Amino acid sequence: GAMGSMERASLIQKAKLAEQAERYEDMAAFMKGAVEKGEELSCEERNLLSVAYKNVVGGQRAAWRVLSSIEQKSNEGPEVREYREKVETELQGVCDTVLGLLDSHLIKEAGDAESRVFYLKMKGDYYRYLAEVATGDDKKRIIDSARSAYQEAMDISKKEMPPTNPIRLGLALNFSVFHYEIANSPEEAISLAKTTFDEAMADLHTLSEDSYKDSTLIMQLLRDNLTLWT
């Protein structure tokens, strides 16, 4: 890769600079380069990787939704479909890149609960983003790949992490969104969000003020969804 000649520490430093500059494509390329050095990532480095690609794919998802909406209205020349396909293909390429990094070899080297659950959640997330645009022969298989990754992450997180752990909470949040938006399972989504919220509420008393702030931030997202969904 084009980052093969740059020091790992320099790539991490430049990822942080790119974040400050809101240059998320650069940030993602720097963190991809850091991953490809082959060493495991620290907690801070995993978060940089996630921030970078979440922002890149988030712009593509927003664009895809705009174009898909225009396309569906046009069906109530080929240019709208063509351009939606272009954005869709670029989005799929970003998801494939992230999934490739997780498979080669972040997940298999991740032994601690925090890293392994973080990466398996990411795997669920990027299969979920693929699922949002999928439409034939493979939508079902993409959905089940997302489900499988989320489920393995859930199983580990419930055995190894406290109910207020922000990674565990963000995982449960995203799996509940998977149920509601992708898998046509709104009741599963609501049940998961409710149980997750209530079990976290009962564990808040164990936390410092700073940990309590981290946990309650994600709990509020669970509550916001329950308010939208019920």
């Binding site: 922000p166 949040l173 969104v177 938006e181």
Partner: peptide, 9 residues
């Protein structure tokens, strides 16, 4: 629906 922030402690 709201999904998780990227950065998680």
């Amino acid at each position: 629906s709201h999904s998780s922030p990227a950065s998680l402690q």
